[PDB]
Amino acid sequence: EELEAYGISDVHDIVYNPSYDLLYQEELDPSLTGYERGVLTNLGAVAVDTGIFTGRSPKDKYIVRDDTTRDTFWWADKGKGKNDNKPLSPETWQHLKGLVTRQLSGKRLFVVDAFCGANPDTRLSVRFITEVAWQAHFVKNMFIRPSDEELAGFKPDFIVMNGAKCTNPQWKEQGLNSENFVAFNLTERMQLIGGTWYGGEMKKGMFSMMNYLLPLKGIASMHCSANVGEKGDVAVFFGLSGTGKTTLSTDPKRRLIGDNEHGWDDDGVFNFEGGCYAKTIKLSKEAEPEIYNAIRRDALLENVTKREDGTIDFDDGSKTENTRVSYPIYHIDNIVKPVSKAGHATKVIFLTADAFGVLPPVSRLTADQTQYHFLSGFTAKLAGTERGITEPTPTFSACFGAAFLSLHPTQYAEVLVKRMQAAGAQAYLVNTGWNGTGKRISIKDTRAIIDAILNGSLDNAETFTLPMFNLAIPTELPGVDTKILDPRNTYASPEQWQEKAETLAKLFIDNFDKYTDTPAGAALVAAGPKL
Numbered sequence: 258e259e260l261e262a263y264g265i266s267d268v269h270d271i272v273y274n275p276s277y278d279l280l281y282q283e284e285l286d287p288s289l290t291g292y293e294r295g296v297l298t299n300l301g302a303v304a305v306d307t308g309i310f311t312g313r314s315p316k317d318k319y320i321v322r323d324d325t326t327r328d329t330f331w332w333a334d335k336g337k338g339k340n341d342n343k344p345l346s347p348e349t350w351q352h353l354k355g356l357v358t359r360q361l362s363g364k365r366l367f368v369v370d371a372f373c374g375a376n377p378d379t380r381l382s383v384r385f386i387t388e389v390a391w392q393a394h395f396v397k398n399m400f401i402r403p404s405d406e407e408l409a410g411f412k413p414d415f416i417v418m419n420g421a422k423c424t425n426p427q428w429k430e431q432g433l434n435s436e437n438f439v440a441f442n443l444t445e446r447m448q449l450i451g452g453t454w455y456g457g458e459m460k461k462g463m464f465s466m467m468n469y470l471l472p473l474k475g476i477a478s479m480h481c482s483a484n485v486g487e488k489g490d491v492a493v494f495f496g497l498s499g500t501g502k503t504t505l506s507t508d509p510k511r512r513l514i515g516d517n518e519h520g521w522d523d524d525g526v527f528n529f530e531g532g533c534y535a536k537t538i539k540l541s542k543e544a545e546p547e548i549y550n551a552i553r554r555d556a557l558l559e560n561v562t563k564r565e566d567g568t569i570d571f572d573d574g575s576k577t578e579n580t581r582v583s584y585p586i587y588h589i590d591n592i593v594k595p596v597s598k599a600g601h602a603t604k605v606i607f608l609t610a611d612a613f614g615v616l617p618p619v620s621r622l623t624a625d626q627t628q629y630h631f632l633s634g635f636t637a638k639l640a641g642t643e644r645g646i647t648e649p650t651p652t653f654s655a656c657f658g659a660a661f662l663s664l665h666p667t668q669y670a671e672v673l674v675k676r677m678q679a680a681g682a683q684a685y686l687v688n689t690g691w692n693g694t695g696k697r698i699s700i701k702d703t704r705a706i707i708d709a710i711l712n713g714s715l716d717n718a719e720t721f722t723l724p725m726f727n728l729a730i731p732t733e734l735p736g737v738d739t740k741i742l743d744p745r746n747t748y749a750s751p752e753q754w755q756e757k758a759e760t761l762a763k764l765f766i767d768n769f770d771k772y773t774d775t776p777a778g779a780a781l782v783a784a785g786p787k788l
């Protein structure tokens with residue numbers, strides 16, 4: 258009955274906050290067809306196929322432009338700088354809402370109530386509606402699970418309606434990218450999904466909403482993982498996709514706060530999420546034992562290859578290289594509990610995967626370099642590996658998360674700088690990507706570098722200035738091969754490094770040009786690379 262307030266009709270069965278045991282039974286029902294079907298692996302975790310979409314679809318993301326959002330959002334068609342916040346008319350929104358609500362009508366529906374945000378004063382109460390059990394399972398893992406008493410007076414602040422099985426046949430007449438859609442309306446406080454079954458759309462959708470509400474309130478909202486040592490020292494790790502946020506924050510010596518989305522308020526750093534979402538391509542249980550051991554009943558594997566005997570081929574990227582496992586955060590043994598939060602960060606680490614092979618494995622940044630690299634948000638990929646030999650493709654994504662920013666990048670920079678300054682925090686740039694060898698730096702060497710950051714080894718090392726980027730790098734560090742610390746050493750001659758460094762420096766300079774129309778931003782050019 259209460260679902261008719263959202264536009265949904267004739268629902269006979271509501272499955273309200275299903276238990277983990279019920280979701281297991283629902284996923285393994287032998288009568289399911291198509292992409293609803295799950296299969297049981299020998300690790301005890303259920304595995305599913307997410308269908309045509311095996312990752313996010315930024316080209317299909319729209320935000321209703323109305324008097325609530327017109328003058329506050331960072332719009333794709335207005336400011337400087339590329340972003341995916343494409344404006345949507347209220348009229349087209351009503352068309353999309355009718356598509357989704359008719360798809361959900363007459364169905365058996367799963368409804369999951371959950372929180373986004375660890376702190377009662379700023380968290381969003383979210384109600385997710387789906388007709389697919391494993392999608393309800395994804396949101397149960399990834400958001401904060403309310404207690405019985407919190408469900409009693411639950412009042413949603415936001416509604417997410419997942420109409421994955423429907424599509425929009427009028428898209429060409431409406432100026433949209435395709436028949437699929439991921440749409441947000443901040444007047445109605447709703448998210449609609451059509452066409453894509455990929456669960457990450459709901460996770461990153463709610464993160465975009467927190468990126469809108471919080472910085473406005475003086476609270477930093479950060480695309481980062483976070484953890485805390487036995488002495489109470491908090492570290493945060495920013496980074497773009499596949500740079501290592503989950504991998505490197507999940508350390509058995511430190512208590513995990515969270516692996517992907519955090520805020521930073523007057524009391525400290527807090528997780529938005531209740532679970533973890535780890536990349537599993539080529540997963541190695543010797544290199545990632547805590548993540549591998551989280552894969553058991555109530556974890557949800559996505560798009561991995563499951564053999565006839567139920568065993569898992571983690572090396573197989575034939576459906577996608579974005580294979581994934583989600584698990585509630587308590588599948589990790591050493592976490593902060595019962596609430597995922599801690600004090601003020603004193604170490605801020607920017608992870609980048611540099612496929613140009615130019616950046617050092619680690620550098621301590623000056624204050625202005627911190628703002629510069631935060632706004633630049635650089636990473637690069639090997640694009641055409643499949644095409645035999647391949648070259649590198651750069652991404653500049655402001656704040657290491659431009660796909661999720663709802664406000665202008667300088668608004669996130671300003672609140673983050675405020676929090677860092679008050680805590681006496683220091684920032685570091687860590688290349689988890691490539692060097693002159695054409696191979697990624699190993700997880701073992703990356704973990705030893707992080708350890709040397711967190712224990713103050715790096716702070717106390719002798720350093721020199723890497724040219725062009727003007728990055729302070731150490732001459733040596735406990736636990737790390739000394740050779741790799743200077744990226745020039747990993748080439749035959751240092752002139753090979755020089756040529757790539759010049760190519761890369763020019764990409765940074767061109768990218769930063771859009772921030773230099775204010776005085777503060779023009780002054781930051783001096784912190785950036787210099788030809």
Ligand SMILES: Nc1ncnc2c1ncn2[C@@H]1O[C@H](COP(=O)(O)OP(=O)(O)OP(=O)(O)O)[C@@H](O)[C@H]1O
Nearest residue numbers: 498499500501502503504535536689698699700703
């Ligand atoms: N030196 C390294 N450090 C960290 N990760 C590495 C390294 N070398 C390879 N990897 C691989 O990179 C991937 C990082 O996955 P992870 O889930 O940590 O990404 P993430 O930054 O959390 O991004 P996403 O938001 O896409 O999940 C894993 O497949 C990991 O094994």
Ligand SMILES: [Ca+2]
Nearest residue numbers: 497498499517
């Ligand atoms: Ca990510």
Ligand SMILES: [Mg+2]
Nearest residue numbers: 503534535536
């Ligand atoms: Mg991850």
